[PDB]
Design a binder for this molecule. Structure first.
Ligand SMILES: O=C(O)[C@H]1O[C@@H](Oc2ccc([N+](=O)[O-])cc2)[C@H](O)[C@@H](O)[C@@H]1O[C@H]1O[C@H](CO)[C@@H](O[C@@H]2O[C@H](C(=O)O)[C@@H](O[C@H]3O[C@H](CO)[C@@H](O[C@@H]4O[C@H](C(=O)O)[C@@H](O[C@H]5O[C@H](CO)[C@@H](O)[C@H](O)[C@H]5NS(=O)(=O)O)[C@H](O)[C@H]4O)[C@H](O)[C@H]3NS(=O)(=O)O)[C@H](O)[C@H]2O)[C@H](O)[C@H]1NS(=O)(=O)O
Ligand SMILES: OC[C@H]1O[C@H](O[C@H]2[C@H](O)[C@@H](O)[C@@H](O[C@H]3[C@H](O)[C@@H](O)[C@@H](O[C@H]4[C@H](O)[C@@H](O)[C@@H](O)O[C@@H]4CO)O[C@@H]3CO)O[C@@H]2CO)[C@H](O)[C@@H](O)[C@@H]1O
Ligand SMILES: Nc1ncnc2c1ncn2[C@@H]1O[C@H](COP(=O)(O)O)[C@@H](OP(=O)(O)O)[C@H]1O
Ligand SMILES: [Cl-]
Ligand SMILES: [Cl-]
Ligand SMILES: [Cl-]
Ligand code: NA
Ligand code: NA
Ligand code: NA
Length: 670
């Protein structure tokens, strides 16, 4: 981000040419250039790039995205004088308050309305229920009743919410992120009506923003559902149109989620005072908002003076009527997960490929960030026969506490013939009773015989050969930010693991495939910033990479497929291989790890595992923005760990409760 300049991001459906005009006046008065951009998916790109040193100085979006940004430390707190604050409606400052603090400037209130062509339909329907009959009449004239974007849940939510659907329940002063209302009777009724419209061929499941707009603006459909920004193109096409209240469903109003277009300032911006000057003294004025509004209408603006001037517009009046009937959007971080979940459910239900009940049940799970596991997933029962051909394989991922765990395996298990660990020697002899065969494949028993820190790909291709059986794979996982910091500190003190083979499809990677991050013999002394800056850093997503079948993505050759394709494959492969292992533990749960290992393999340790909280990672002082960038560099590991933690904890509770019930039965039979 260049100092002395302003870079602004705003969505492509807003008045970015008018905003540019405000930017030109600012430049006239100050010599500060203002660049407006409208990149695609700006609301996903921003948390990826703000967490580094790129991104815009100012980001525009509806307020629902901003709590997530704020929780990640990506936004400067805004500090407007009480004088300026009173120039805007308090209603709209509420939309941009997060954990007590103001994190953006509110701009305008947006709500969806029903838009109709007065030359085809001078009185629009009051109910969703009468739309099928209307469409039948219109189809005989070569036209349709209604087309609107069915791909974005923003547009279908008003009907889904009408009879009772909700996102997160509000109770006791906060949003309950476990109480999700996307599969209740009301939500199901709303979505069923929409699905029936499609089944009865009054709408098409493929209709998106462009198709609906094109049809309405060409007079092919009598109605659409859209927001104030859409009015400009309708005027461009010279359609004679009205804007009115959304139809009712089962006698209740459609309930649009209400958005406040808001302007946040990047916490990494070196131009924060200029951003505040632009927003307060140029944009949030009658003149500035008029420039934007004349390009694409904002709706009901937040500035009291200019809102009063436009309030007579019946299109805005209709916008306010639908907004009062709807709900202000929560700004909490979980909003994005809600939207993603509903987006997928509506698409699959509307397509007919899944019923409403099944699709909304899946959305409920995803919106509440839950994991459903089968009994088989929670049951890991290994009749481990050390005298037989069973072999335990410990896959050690760097910096997951594998030294501690590996030492437990060779020093701390109660066995008739335990591992023979000679004093002052690194490895131990872990042989079956009376044989020269090992029962444990591990760093401290067999050594690195399949490669230094051999991963799932290397071990599954090498272990069966280098031992000739039942192989029981186990590993440890650690929360990725701590694991990444631990690896940074270890590399900073000389670790390279440069002799790892990284074998996959029968060869090690090429230097072009896997460039070294450092000059010389190691990367000692590296700062956290330079560590994070190397694109080929093997610390990034190490746990997913080392648990996945890397053949599935062309081994280490990043040109074989795109990231959008490689990333979901790696994650699903890692989740599957982890889940289907005999056992895994988590570094942060040493006692539960011990207990589950014991109950999985029917073994007992001599001395209790212990939790060490004062790790080198814990000692790193981590700003929130920097934690967020580490999460972004490790986004696959973040997802894997969330999955693994929940499975691990459900396994612990399952095994404990079974064991507690067995003890009781013993008592109740004596
Ligand atoms: O045998 C020969 O060929 C020798 O022949 C001699 O000449 C003659 C001639 C004639 C006769 N005669 O009788 O007539 C005899 C001999 C030559 O003079 C001589 O050159 C030649 O020697 C070669 O062959 C030797 C036998 O193989 C060999 O010596 C062995 O070396 C092994 C080795 O270095 O690998 C050694 O193994 C032990 O030490 C290793 C090094 O420490 C261990 O491996 C390391 O393990 C680390 C670990 O797990 O902690 C790992 O560290 C990394 O990961 C950890 C965990 O994440 C992290 O904490 C660390 O920070 C991280 N470090 S890193 O730098 O970032 O990687 C290391 O990476 C890994 O290297 C190993 O586990 C030990 N095994 S053991 O316990 O079983 O011993 C072995 O013991 C030696 O015997 C020589 O190396 C050969 N020399 S060469 O010139 O040919 O190369
Ligand atoms: O991978 C699927 C899609 O993912 C992306 O879209 C996501 C967004 O990232 C989420 O933030 C959310 O979008 C919400 C949005 O936050 C909310 O404000 C509202 O957006 C309105 C907006 O307020 C209004 O001003 C106008 O611009 O219309 C918008 C709706 O189009 O509602 C959104 C939900 O529909 O969830 C979506 C997924 O639905 C990504 O951007 C997509 O390209 C991608 O396909
Ligand atoms: N019982 C325990 N409880 C918590 N962390 C532990 C632990 N045993 C080891 N660790 C942590 O695991 C890391 C070592 O992992 P590995 O043996 O795979 O290299 C270290 O992290 P730090 O570097 O942050 O201190 C260490 O502190
Ligand atoms: Cl070794
Ligand atoms: Cl624990
Ligand atoms: Cl047991
Ligand atoms: Na160490
Ligand atoms: Na170096
Ligand atoms: Na800390």
């Amino acid at each position: 981000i260049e100092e002395g300049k302003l870079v602004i991001w705003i969505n492509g459906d807003k008045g970015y040419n008018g905003l540019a005009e405000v930017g030109k006046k600012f430049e006239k008065d100050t010599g500060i250039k203002v660049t407006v951009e409208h990149p695609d998916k700006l609301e996903e790109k921003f948390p990826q790039v703000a967490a580094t040193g790129d991104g815009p100085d100012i980001i525009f979006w509806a307020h629902d995205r901003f709590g997530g940004y704020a929780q990640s430390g990506l936004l400067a707190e805004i500090t407007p004088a009480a004088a300026f604050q009173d120039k805007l409606y308090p209603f709209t400052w509420d939309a941009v308050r997060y954990n007590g603090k103001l994190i953006a400037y509110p701009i305008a209130v947006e709500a969806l309305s029903l838009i109709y062509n007065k030359d085809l339909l001078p009185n629009p329907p009051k109910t969703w229920e009468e739309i099928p009959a209307l469409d039948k009449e219109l189809k005989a004239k070569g036209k349709s009743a209604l087309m609107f974007n069915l791909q974005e849940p923003y547009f279908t939510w008003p009907l889904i919410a009408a009879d009772g659907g909700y996102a997160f329940k509000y109770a006791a002063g906060k949003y309950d992120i476990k109480d999700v209302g996307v599969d209740n009777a009301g939500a199901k009724a709303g979505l069923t009506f929409l699905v029936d419209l499609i089944k009865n061929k009054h709408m098409n499941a493929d209709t998106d923003y462009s198709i609906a707009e094109a049809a309405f603006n060409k007079g092919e459909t009598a109605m659409t559902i859209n927001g104030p920004w859409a009015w400009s193109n309708i005027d461009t096409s010279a359609v004679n149109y009205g804007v009115t209240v959304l139809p009712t469903f089962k006698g209740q109003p459609s309930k649009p989620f209400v958005g406040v277009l808001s302007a946040g300032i990047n916490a990494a911006s070196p131009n924060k005072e200029l951003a505040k000057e632009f927003l307060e003294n140029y944009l949030l004025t009658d003149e500035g908002l008029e420039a934007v509004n004349k390009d694409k209408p904002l709706g009901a603006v937040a500035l009291k003076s200019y809102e009063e001037e436009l309030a007579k517009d019946p299109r805005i009046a209709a916008t306010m009527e639908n907004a009062q009937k709807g709900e202000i959007m929560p700004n909490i971080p979980q909003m994005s997960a809600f939207w993603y979940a509903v987006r997928t459910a509506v698409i699959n239900a509307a397509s007919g490929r899944q019923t409403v009940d099944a699709a909304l049940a899946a959305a409920q799970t995803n919106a509440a960030a839950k994991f459903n596991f089968t009994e088989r997933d929670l049951t890991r029962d290994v009749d481990f026969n050390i005298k037989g051909d069973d072999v335990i394989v410990f896959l050690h991922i760097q910096k997951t506490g594998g030294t501690t765990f590996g030492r437990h395996l060779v020093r701390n298990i109660r066995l008739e013939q335990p591992c023979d660990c000679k004093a002052g020697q690194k490895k131990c002899t872990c042989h079956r009773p009376g044989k020269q065969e090992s029962w444990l494949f591990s760093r401290f028993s067999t050594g690195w015989s399949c490669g230094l820190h051999a991963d799932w790909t290397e071990l599954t291709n090498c272990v069966p050969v280098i031992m000739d059986r039942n192989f029981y794979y186990i590993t440890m996982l650690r929360d990725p930010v701590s694991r990444y910091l631990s690896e940074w500190k270890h590399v900073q003190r000389g670790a390279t693991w440069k002799t790892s083979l990284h074998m996959c499809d029968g060869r090690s990677p090429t230097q072009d495939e896997l460039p070294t991050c450092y000059n010389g013999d190691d990367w000692s002394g590296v700062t956290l910033h330079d560590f994070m800056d190397c694109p080929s850093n093997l610390a990034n997503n190490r746990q997913v990479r080392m648990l996945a079948d890397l053949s599935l993505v062309g081994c280490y050759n990043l040109s074989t497929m795109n990231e959008s394709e490689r990333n979901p494959i790696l994650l699903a492969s890692a989740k599957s291989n982890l889940k289907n292992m005999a056992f895994y533990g988590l570094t942060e749960f040493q006692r539960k790890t011990q207990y589950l290992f014991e109950r999985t393999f029917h073994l007992r340790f001599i001395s209790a595992f212990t939790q060490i909280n004062s790790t080198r990672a814990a000692n790193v002082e981590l700003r929130d923005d920097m934690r967020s960038r580490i999460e972004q560099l490790n986004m696959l590991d973040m997802q894997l760990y969330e999955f693994a933690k929940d499975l691990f904890l459900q396994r612990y509770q399952f095994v404990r409760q079974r064991e507690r019930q067995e003890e009781r039965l013993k008592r109740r039979e004596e």
